[PDB]
Design a protein around this nucleic acid. Structure first.
Lengths: 37, 136, 180, 174, 138
RNA sequence: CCAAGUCUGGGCUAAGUGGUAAAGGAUGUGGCGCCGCGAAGACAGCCAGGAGGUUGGCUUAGAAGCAGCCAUCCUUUAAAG
RNA sequence: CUCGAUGUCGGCUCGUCGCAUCCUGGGGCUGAAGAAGGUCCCAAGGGUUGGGCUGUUCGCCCAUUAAAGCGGCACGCGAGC
């Protein structure tokens, strides 16, 4: 899941993973592909 | 918005600071870098707060919907007497005392405001007085 | 309790340089005697902060002249707050100008009643009692709804009694966040 | 203090080379990398990673070279085998010698060929996995197999590392 | 598929298969309506009109039931007390309000199963859960 | 490229920012104040218990935390949801 | 700027970049079983029909199709109709 902006974790244990400036949240919930990079 | 019964056509253009500051409940929105602001949008924040809160504990206010603007026509050429009044707003430009009580006893009120504004019309922050303030 | 480190050149310029240093301008005033001393912020503040220490004076040590002071005027700088100049009064004996800490128990009957929330107008009081008043001018009242409001009247003047303000006007009241 | 501590037993051929620390044990003189400032020691039984400063880059670096060569060696002591469990009524597992095999994708020609330290263990074939030598290389290959037919968190006929509890997405009506 | 362990069932003594807690409930959860129900009758039938809570299953001691264990706090309080359903709203309404002594008394009355049991525990719990429903102190 | 230090001195980024933009969103990077804590020996790592009226309000088919509108306590130490 | 002058619609004929991608693939996602859908990020390579009526580009209808995309260049084109 992508959104140029917003990404604010939610699978509650939802993770702030820095990947090439790629502001991406990694989790255990398909729902949370937090892609804002 | 509100400014009911005014008195005249319009203001104009300028601005750089003021005199908003104190506190008044300690659930405050310190406007920061701005200009006027839609009395409506304002209502936005109004609502925003109102709802966040468990829907009752009453907030306060601050800067009034005091001014009137015109885009003049609706989109024509340009020459009328600047006629028509179409927007009505508040005018705060140097970080100000946007006053929002309510009794949320919480960074909850914080939140409601927080975004009401984060949204609102600009750059601003929030807090509570801590240099008190003495009146007559 | 408090203290400070002295001034020289004031009104503005130098003091500014101070702000820079980490020291904001200080006006030292007493019944018709006065000179400028200077503000080292950080701690200045801490104490200030006390607040109870902003209403109710304390002892400032400056060059050894252990003296009594309260805030009587100050310029906190809008642009970020903090100050533009800090002003105090060292006091002999005659304390009349007192805006001291006010507490009261609004013995619930508000938000735990009509939902009504309690708005406080005074929170603090400005009356008299020469160099003698704590951190708690106090009162209280269970009435918290009906449209209820409590005033400078009912008041309830403890120990060193001395209303120096107005014949009522209210201390505060119960606002219907949603009626009652 | 604590970001550089390891013991180097076995008579391990734990020896510094030209830019690479060569850790030799069962077969492979595993190359556990070396940066110019890091620098390290291995005396009697003690193996230590050095810290030529204490900035972010280095600190991580420490954790690295340390756990890594750490690996290199503990490894060389043994070799490295991978614990993979195939499980799926839709799959078969047989070695063939130097080759994959196995299938669920109904056209079975599944011919792989264990790169190196990698050997195939099919005693099952449910419990069936691999062995390697190179900490990662092994993991990687395992993933290779796994993924190539594995996923299934709603109905499952797959290859599973240890066999993580993996999701259980319900279906039609219920 | 069939999860096996004591299933808690809150019911009306004298009765025998409450639609909600014993109809489906017992049945699919791990208990059973009519039979657990009638052994129950045999028992809770003499204690049922101020709240009857029991946990049941085919359990150790080799039998069917498990433990009949004092009516929930608030339910028995009110149930000895007076009005009807929950006070529609507690705290704010202040519609149901009991009396000190009266509280300590019914308190000791049912007190037995009390967590460790005592006068303070009984009366205090009364006030607590009492308010909880709408049974405030007054 | 074309005249003149690929000066010296102390810093910060490293995206090429050099070489153009906001609201805004962040375990970037570096810098300074308030808290809890290693000997009421910490936290991440990790053993075991995750308590007894709690499983009280409308819906009550269900809030009987984990449908939703009210409360916001009682017993009791893992300590207290 | 342009008038001692720059020929403006539509349509031909021949086009040429763009991607906010219609069709093509690669994709994480689902309120994904399959299938087929819908939801975003990557990628312009190639592809991107015929009629009808209307001077209309637009558009509605006929029959298909993988699809039968939006739009840049005086809304490209008279020293080429």
């Amino acid at each position: 899941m992508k959104v140029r902006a917003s990404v604010k974790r939610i699978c509650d244990k939802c993770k702030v993973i820095r990947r090439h400036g790629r502001v991406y949240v990694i989790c255990e919930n398909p729902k949370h592909k937090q892609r804002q990079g | 918005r509100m400014k009911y019964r005014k008195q005249q056509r319009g203001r104009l253009k300028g601005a750089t600071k003021g005199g908003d500051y104190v506190a008044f409940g300690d659930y405050g929105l310190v406007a920061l870098e701005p200009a006027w602001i839609t009395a409506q949008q304002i209502e936005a924040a109004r609502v925003a707060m109102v709802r966040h809160f468990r829907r009752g504990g009453k907030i306060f206010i601050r800067i009034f919907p005091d001014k009137p603007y015109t885009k003049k026509p609706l989109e024509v050429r340009m020459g009328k007497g600047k006629g028509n009044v179409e927007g009505y707003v508040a005018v705060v430009k140097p970080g100000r005392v946007m006053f929002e009580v309510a009794g949320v006893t919480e960074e909850q009120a914080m939140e409601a405001l927080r975004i009401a504004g984060h949204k609102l019309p600009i750059k601003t922050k929030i807090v509570r007085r801590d240099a008190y303030d003495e009146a007559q | 309790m408090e203290y400070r480190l002295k001034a020289y050149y004031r009104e503005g310029e130098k003091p500014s340089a101070l702000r820079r240093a980490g020291k904001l301008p200080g006006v030292m005033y007493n019944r018709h005697l006065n000179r400028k001393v200077y503000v080292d912020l950080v701690e200045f503040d801490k104490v200030f902060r006390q607040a109870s220490i902003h209403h109710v004076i304390v002892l400032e040590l400056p060059d050894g002249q252990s003296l009594p002071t309260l805030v009587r005027q100050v310029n906190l700088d809008k642009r970020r707050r903090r100050p533009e100049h800090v002003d105090f009064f060292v006091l002999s004996d005659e304390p009349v100008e007192m805006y001291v800490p006010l507490r009261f128990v609004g013995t619930p009957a508000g938000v735990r009643a009509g939902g009504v929330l309690q708005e406080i107008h005074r929170d603090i009081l400005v009356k008299v009692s020469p160099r003698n008043i704590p951190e708690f001018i106090e009162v209280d009242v269970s009435g918290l709804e009906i449209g209820d409001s409590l005033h400078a009247s009912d008041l309830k003047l403890p120990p060193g009694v001395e209303l120096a303000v107005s014949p009522e006007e209210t201390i505060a009241a119960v606002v219907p966040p949603e009626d009652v | 203090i604590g970001r550089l501590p390891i013991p180097v037993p076995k008579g391990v051929s734990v020896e510094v080379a030209p830019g690479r620390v060569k850790v030799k044990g069962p077969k492979g003189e595993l190359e556990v990398p070396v940066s110019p400032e890091m620098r390290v020691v291995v005396e009697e039984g003690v193996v230590r990673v050095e810290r030529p400063s204490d900035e972010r880059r280095h600190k991580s670096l420490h954790g690295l070279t340390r756990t890594l060569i750490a690996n290199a060696v503990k490894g060389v002591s043994e070799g490295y085998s991978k614990e993979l469990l195939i499980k799926g009524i839709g799959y078969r597992a047989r070695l063939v010698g130097r080759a994959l095999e196995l299938t669920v994708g109904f056209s079975h020609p599944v011919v792989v060929e264990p790169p190196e330290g990698i050997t195939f263990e099919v005693p099952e074939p449910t419990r069936v996995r691999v062995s390697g030598i190179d900490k990662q290389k092994v993991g990687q290959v395992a993933a290779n197999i796994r993924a190539i037919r594995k996923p299934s968190a709603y109905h499952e006929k797959g290859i599973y590392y240890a066999g993580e509890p993996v999701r259980l997405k319900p279906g039609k009506a219920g | 598929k069939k999860v096996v362990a004591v299933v808690k069932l809150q019911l009306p003594a004298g009765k025998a298969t409450p639609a909600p807690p014993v109809g489906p409930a017992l049945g699919q959860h791990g208990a059973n309506i009519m039979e657990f129900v009638k052994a129950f009758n045999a028992a809770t039938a003499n204690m049922g009109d101020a709240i009857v809570p029991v946990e049941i299953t085919i359990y150790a001691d080799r039998s069917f039931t498990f433990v009949t264990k004092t009516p929930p706090a608030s339910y028995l309080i009110r149930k000895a007390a007076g009005l009807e359903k929950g006070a529609h709203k507690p705290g704010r309404e202040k519609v149901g309000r009991i009396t000190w002594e009266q509280v300590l008394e019914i308190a000791k009355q049912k007190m037995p199963d009390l967590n460790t049991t005592d006068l303070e525990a009984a009366a205090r719990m009364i006030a607590g859960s009492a308010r909880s429903m709408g049974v405030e102190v007054v």
